[PDB]
Design a protein around this ligand. Structure first.
Ligand SMILES: CO[C@H]1O[C@H](CO)[C@H](O)[C@H](O[C@@H]2O[C@H](CO)[C@H](O)[C@H](O)[C@H]2NC(C)=O)[C@H]1O
Ligand SMILES: CO[C@H]1O[C@H](CO)[C@H](O)[C@H](O[C@@H]2O[C@H](CO)[C@H](O)[C@H](O)[C@H]2NC(C)=O)[C@H]1O
Ligand SMILES: CO[C@H]1O[C@H](CO)[C@H](O)[C@H](O)[C@H]1NC(C)=O
Ligand SMILES: CO[C@H]1O[C@H](CO)[C@H](O)[C@H](O)[C@H]1NC(C)=O
Lengths: 133, 15, 15, 133, 15, 133, 15, 133
């Protein structure tokens, strides 16, 4: 898939992703906070369409992500991120996608997610996160 | 809170 | 170099 | 003076300041690097005019600031930053302004300057810097 | 306060 | 179980843990690096005995942990860390313990594990890690 | 490498 | 002089230095905090004697250093740190030594001094500080 790297920012304001309850996660785009100002990240899109869009608006700066979990699995022979869930200090968003395969979760005692990077072909191949104090 | 922080040195000049 | 770095965890999914 | 705070970024690409060889530093504006892309910072201007502009273009990312020095002094009864000097790993820019008053210098063994904040009335009242690895 | 802090991920295991 | 928190250090030199191939992880103790000098961490022990000791000596500082994975599961009604695996840039140590339950993994693109904290009763109840550049 | 690093300012004094 | 590098710690609890009101700073030794426990740093001593000892006990962890200032100057042809002053959020300790030469100051808006490194011959030749969040 096509790789992407948004880099790091001051925080996260909104997350826009899409999925298919039969395959995996599709598009991914984030609206970060850049020193108090909204910064619209580049929209990373799937090579195909047919996904269901989902918008996750966070109550910045009082609401922030505390944990990220999901499933990675096999789809058409490719290992991809099939499901994703974002738990903040105020609410839980998801799961989105197919909750099948091998689970993974990232709880954060101290710190913030300040950036995303990954790859997207037909689906989200993989992703990593930037952590900061 | 949800704002990332970093080290800051200073200020220099008017106190 | 002159590029600021930060901690990065992952990736999850395709290796 | 009017306070400003650019926040933090990935690095510094260019610095645009002005001064008067009789008074002190006037305007201040920085073009930061935001995850590989130039980010034009807000131009913080003096309440008055008559300054000499100076542009400091750095060879990003191979050239970065290693030390910042200058003088703070008294002008019309206000304590301000009268002089400023930026020494990178490739060249020395300055001094700019009046080299009179009490000196200050910030050498950096490990780390980078990733942001500026301060105040500007007729002159640069004071300033602070964001440091990062 | 005067205690240095750092990023912490977890916990994994009992809630 | 009894909680512990080693705090943060400069790095990791050696890890000493024990396990039982039928239950879960038992004892845990780490020898950290404190600015170039070995620092023997406190040995956190299980309330019971019967575990198999394992010593993981890392080639500090050229060898460091890149990923930590394992399984959390149910043992006598308590949720604990049943298995643990440490993958460095030179070797893979483990799995140690029972590879059964729900999996978790922490891959690190950029950064180092500089400290551990957790809880231990009959078994390792849970644990968290300190990350640093 | 496996050594944790941190910001360092200075030196002040003899060159 | 002989160089030293204490490395980085969790914080500072006590500082023990000596000086001569005619020359400069002599001995330097720090008692750091290592994850809640006092850690006695190595005592870096001058090649000569005749200094006046000074102990700076900080009310850890509620009291921390906010600014460090002093003077660097010429003594017997060697450039050294002639004076030092530690200003915390509760008190100002010093100046200690001779307040003559070129001044330097390090004010900290956000962050902590977690370590010292430098060199000492007859006097403190130079020093640097570790900064951390
Ligand atoms: C056999 O029980 C003992 O060991 C298990 C597994 O390691 C737990 O550590 C038990 O601790 C208790 O755990 C509870 C949650 O599962 C809760 O924290 C209890 O307060 C805690 N009690 C004690 C005495 O540690 C441990 O007893
Ligand atoms: C009296 O000389 C001795 O003390 C001074 C002042 O503290 C210096 O530390 C001298 O060290 C020498 O300093 C030179 C630069 O000023 C240079 O580094 C020399 O290599 C160094 N020599 C030694 C033996 O330390 C110190 O001798
Ligand atoms: C059908 O394959 C494509 O999609 C895969 C999965 O999300 C992968 O991203 C795979 O790499 C990509 N192929 C190319 C050439 O980009
Ligand atoms: C003549 O004064 C003004 O300029 C000063 C110096 O740079 C100071 O910035 C001073 O605060 C500012 N006054 C106001 C009201 O902004």
């Amino acid at each position: 898939g096509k790789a992407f790297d948004d880099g790091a920012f001051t925080g996260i304001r909104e997350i826009n992703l899409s999925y298919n309850k039969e395959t995996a996660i599709g598009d991914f785009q984030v609206v970060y906070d850049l020193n108090g100002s909204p910064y619209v990240g580049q929209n990373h899109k799937s090579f195909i369409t047919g996904f269901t869009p989902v918008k996750i608006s966070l109550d910045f700066p009082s609401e922030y992500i505390m944990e990220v979990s999901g499933y990675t699995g096999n789809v058409s022979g490719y290992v991809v991120v099939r499901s994703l869930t974002f738990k903040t200090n105020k609410k839980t968003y998801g799961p989105y996608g197919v909750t099948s395969g091998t689970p993974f979760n990232l709880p954060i005692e101290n710190g913030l997610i300040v950036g995303f990077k990954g790859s997207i072909g037909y689906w989200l191949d993989y992703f990593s996160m930037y952590l900061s104090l | 809170s949800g704002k990332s922080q970093t080290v800051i040195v200073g200020p220099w000049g008017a106190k």
